[PDB]
Amino acid sequence: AVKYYTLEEIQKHNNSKSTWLILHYKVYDLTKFLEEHPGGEEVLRAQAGGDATANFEAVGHSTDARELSKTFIIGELHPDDR
Ligand code: HEM
Hints:
Layout: E1 4-5, H1 7-12, E2 14-15, E3 18-23, E4 26-29, H2 41-47, H3 53-58, H4 63-72, E5 73-77
Parallel strand pairs: 1-5
Antiparallel strand pairs: 2-3, 3-4, 4-5
PDB class: electron transport
Keywords: Electron transport, Transmembrane, Heme, Microsome
Assembly: monomeric
């Protein structure tokens, strides 16, 4: 199962209270990951509300990181937005 969230909504979740972004048309809550993320908070938060696939892939991110991302998958991008 998965919950679908609208890009509208995701754009509201783009700051300290909620840092969510699209990667590969899925919604990753990194809100409680800001401090943890070795790349720093601002790098995600800058793209948050938007898609960051290109950045995520440009950075490579280890298999383990990709796997860890699943732990933050809170939903998919709504098909209306896809
Ligand atoms: C999907 C959620 C993400 C997870 C779980 C995650 C996890 C990690 C981890 C564990 C590292 C260490 C690199 C490694 O060992 O593979 C890292 C580095 C990094 N991440 Fe992420 N990341 C995520 C999303 C993003 C996003 C959206 C961006 C910002 C556009 C980003 C930018 C970076 C940068 C700049 C580094 C540092 C690379 C360096 O050391 O030069 N990450 N991330």
